[PDB]
């Protein structure tokens, strides 16, 4: 039978870890430099004569 | 009579003008890096026994 091979692993390393930011919605909007708000919106308008 | 003395004056330079920038309500906003949303609060809860 062919059957799962799960190699010898080392402990988790500090480095590795970057989950802990953003496993939850919230989360996922801390991690944002900038979020989108009304006023950074321009709306182009075409002007006929 | 003390006068309003005047120094004569050159020409503006580009350099200095920085006013286009900020001189409209909304334009105050554009110059912010960040605005502030109410996603980004975190109120403190003292919680008694």
Redesign the interface.
């Known amino acids: 039978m062919h059957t799962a091979e799960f190699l010898e692993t080392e402990p988790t390393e500090i480095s590795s870890v970057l989950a802990g930011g953003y496993n939850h919605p919230?989360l996922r909007?801390?991690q944002s430099?900038?979020?989108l708000?009304k006023?950074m919106l321009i709306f182009p308008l075409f002007i006929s004569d």
Chains 1, 2 share one sequence.
Do not use: G, V
């Open positions: 919230l909007q801390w430099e900038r979020q708000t006023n």
